[PDB]
Every structure is written in structure tokens, then in C-alpha cells.
């Protein structure tokens, strides 16, 4: 059914911690708990291990990505910025 | 107290032997003070020199760049670095009610001299034309532009730097993109606007002293 209107994942804290510190966790905490799509075997089994580490359910290939997510917004830029220096000047 | 201009000397800079006039001018440089030796204290001087002081007949509104690469004592030699048009031409041929088309391309030679070519062109109000808005459609713009970069890729990808740099003193590339576009839309003031150098291949002195021969 519909069980809430404005908490979602942070209903487990309840009446505690405030309302702009449970608004802050609910974007990080659905992000760290979701199952991301594997860029190596197509499936969605990227279950987050300890912080930094990410790991497939199947094909068993462990990627060290973001901390609360999989792809850091800066590290998406960097991998597409390293290869910019790799073809310009050829080094 | 001390004059710091008598501690200088005066070399002279020479154009490549692919032209007519060789005496560019006399640049000046301080002499050797211990660690600072003045040989490579000028290797890399770019000279804002036009064509009518580097040809005899050719137009005045086009200029070359000519970095300095090595020093033979007083005579100091250069190599082609780039070109561009003078600014008084480039915004006199920009008028209202005619669409400028432009194309740019990174095409390397067969010499390890990756070039970047810039070209412009302006549509042509005809003789008996009565209307004033002589514009081109959008699909005519794209396919002239594909035709423009097709031609300068035939002129630069095929053979090395020297026949390329020899190609644009009479500007055969701009005349050829003139002729092969006017079946789509006629053009009239169609130039290679700017050439930019992107790479440098390991710096021999053999290729320097062949370009400074006859």
C-alpha cells in the first residue's frame, strides 16, 4: 500500500535527528543500498560492500568506485579527461 | 647606470628558401652571460610577416608566422608555423545579407606535421539579382561544408608540409573550393582563413637545412 508521504528510507529514525538531517540521508541512503547495473556483465547486482568497494553478485568482479554511490561525479570527468591527454600530443 | 643595450648583438632572421625574399630583418638578443647562452634564447621567435615583403607580386593582406628553430651564427633560420589573414580584410568581406560558411579540420601531412585548417566563404549576390537577402538553406550549408573539408583533405593528407605550404602562396586550395561549390550555391570571397600548427616531429636539422637551400 501507500505507507507514508514524506520519509521513505529514513522512517527508521522516526521522530529523531531533525528534518534537514533526515532529508540529507535519504538521497545518500537509497544510493548506497540500490543494486546498480554491472558495466561488465550487464546485470544489476552491484551490492555495496564496505565503503568504497562495490561488487557484483555474478561475474564476481570487484570495482572500487564511489563511497555512497558507484560513479563519482568527479571520477566520471577524470576518466574522460585522462584519455583527452592520451590522444592530444600522444602523451 | 650601465647601459643594457650595448650588451646585445644583432643577428638576422632568414625566411625559408621556398620564397623569394630572404632578408626578414635583424632581431636582437642579449649576449651570453655565464649560464644564459643566447643560442636557444631565441629559438621560438614568431615573425608577424606579410606576403608582399616575402613575395614580390602576392597580396598584402595575408601573413605567415615562421617560428625560429636554429642559429647559424649571424644568419638565423626559421620554418613555417602558421598563417592568417589581416583583420582589415577579414571584416571587410563580412557584409550583411549574405551567409558566411566556415569549416575547420585537423588534417595531418605525411611528415608528422598535424595541421589545423580554417576557411571562410561568402555567398554571391548575382548580376541580375533583384532581391537582397541572398541566403543559403541549412542543407546547402552543411553539404558545401562537407565539400570544403573534402578538398583541403585532398591537399594536405596526401603529401608532406612543403608542397602544402607551397600550395597556399597562390592559394590553390581557396580557388578549388570556389569551383567545386558553385554547383550547389555560388560563392565569391572564399579563403583559407587561418592555419594552426599542432605537433612538432622530433626536430631534425636536416629538414631545416633542406628548406634553407636554393
Amino acid at each position: 500500500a501507500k505507507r507514508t508521504k514524506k520519509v521513505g528510507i529514513v522512517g527508521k529514525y522516526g521522530t529523531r535527528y531533525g528534518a534537514s538531517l533526515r532529508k540529507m540521508v535519504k538521497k545518500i541512503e537509497i544510493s548506497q543500498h540500490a543494486k546498480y547495473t554491472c558495466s561488465f556483465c550487464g546485470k544489476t547486482k552491484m551490492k555495496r560492500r564496505a565503503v568504497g568497494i562495490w561488487h557484483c553478485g555474478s561475474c564476481m568482479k570487484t570495482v572500487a568506485g564511489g563511497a555512497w554511490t558507484y560513479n563519482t561525479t568527479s571520477a566520471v570527468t577524470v576518466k574522460s579527461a585522462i584519455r583527452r591527454l592520451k590522444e592530444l600530443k600522444d602523451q | 647606470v650601465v647601459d643594457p643595450f650595448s650588451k646585445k648583438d644583432w643577428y638576422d632572421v632568414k625566411a625559408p628558401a621556398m620564397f623569394n625574399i630572404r632578408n626578414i630583418g635583424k632581431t636582437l638578443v642579449t649576449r651570453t652571460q655565464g649560464t644564459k647562452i643566447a643560442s636557444d634564447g631565441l629559438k621560438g621567435r614568431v615573425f608577424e610577416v606579410s606576403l608582399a615583403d616575402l613575395q614580390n607580386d602576392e597580396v598584402a593582406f595575408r601573413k605567415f608566422k615562421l617560428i625560429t628553430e636554429d642559429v647559424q651564427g649571424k644568419n638565423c633560420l626559421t620554418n613555417f608555423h602558421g598563417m592568417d589573414l589581416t583583420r582589415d580584410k577579414m571584416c571587410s568581406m563580412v557584409k550583411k545579407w549574405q551567409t558566411m560558411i566556415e569549416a575547420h579540420v585537423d588534417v595531418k601531412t605525411t611528415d608528422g606535421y598535424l595541421l589545423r585548417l580554417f576557411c571562410v566563404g561568402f555567398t554571391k549576390k548575382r548580376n541580375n539579382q533583384i532581391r537582397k537577402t541572398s541566403y543559403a538553406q541549412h542543407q546547402q550549408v552543411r553539404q558545401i561544408r562537407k565539400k570544403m573539408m573534402e578538398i583541403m583533405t585532398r591537399e594536405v593528407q596526401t603529401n608532406d608540409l612543403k608542397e602544402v605550404v607551397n600550395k597556399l602562396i597562390p592559394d590553390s586550395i581557396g580557388k578549388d573550393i570556389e569551383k567545386a561549390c558553385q554547383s550547389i550555391y555560388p560563392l565569391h570571397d572564399v579563403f583559407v582563413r587561418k592555419v594552426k600548427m599542432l605537433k612538432k616531429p622530433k626536430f631534425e636539422l636536416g629538414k631545416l637545412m633542406e628548406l634553407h637551400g636554393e
Partner: protein, 137 residues
């Protein structure tokens, strides 16, 4: 002799001359043909003592008188000219010290080569310092 380049009299030597005619000052910076080696940078704000008159047409006049007396003394005889404006984000009209700088340099003993307006031009670059309603004098 040691100073000066060595040429004949029927020939001459070229060194370009940055006439930077912005507003509220004037530069008559001379250099060689490389663009690099500065010969003389005297300034219309240095040869008048007013600060109303840093860009005055009289100021660039006698600045140009001094720089030719320095140019012709060092040995360089003929100039190219590379006049500018304020450039780019700000205004693009060259100030009062343009033609008061060049005719004074012309009348006071100098040969003149290719002259050129080589001021900067952007492609809708940056955002200009006035605010949206502009400076309201």
C-alpha cells in the same frame, strides 16, 4: 662601434611599434620584429604630470617625440604599427591617443611600414563590468 645593427643607408631595418591607445592612458611601446625584445616603453602618463591628462592627445604627442629620439638613436630606422583598443570585454574604440601618437611619430623623423589594427575581439566572451542597468553617470 658596437651598438646598433649594421646596415647600408639605402636599406633600412623594421621593428614593430605597439601603439596602445586605450582610454585614461596612452602607450607608445616600441619593440623589434620578433615581438619580444622591448626597446622603449615611454608613456603619455609619464611625460605629463596631471592625471587628468594621462590619455591626452598632447600627452601622446610628446611621448611619441621621445620614443623616436630613442628609436633613431639606438639604430632602428623604420617601423611597423600595431595599434590597439581597450580590447575584448570592454570597449573597442581606440582612444584620443591614436592619431595624436602616429602623426607626431611621423612628422618627427621616422619611416613607417605596414600599419595594422590588431586589437582583441572575443566571441561573446565573459560578462561585462557594469551591471545589468549599466553604470548610470
Amino acid at each position: 662601434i658596437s651598438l646598433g645593427p649594421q646596415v647600408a643607408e639605402g636599406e633600412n631595418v623594421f621593428g614593430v611599434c605597439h601603439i596602445f591607445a586605450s582610454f585614461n592612458d596612452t602607450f607608445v611601446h616600441v619593440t623589434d620584429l620578433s615581438g619580444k625584445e622591448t626597446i622603449c616603453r615611454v608613456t603619455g602618463g609619464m611625460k605629463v604630470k596631471a592625471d587628468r591628462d594621462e590619455s591626452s592627445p598632447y600627452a601622446a604627442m610628446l611621448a611619441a617625440q621621445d620614443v623616436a629620439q630613442r628609436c633613431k638613436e639606438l639604430g632602428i630606422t623604420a617601423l611597423h604599427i600595431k595599434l590597439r583598443a581597450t580590447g575584448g570585454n570592454r570597449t573597442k574604440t581606440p582612444g584620443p591617443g591614436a592619431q595624436s601618437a602616429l602623426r607626431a611619430l611621423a612628422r618627427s623623423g621616422m619611416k613607417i611600414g605596414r600599419i595594422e589594427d590588431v586589437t582583441p575581439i572575443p566571441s561573446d566572451s565573459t560578462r561585462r563590468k557594469g551591471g545589468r542597468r549599466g553604470r548610470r553617470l
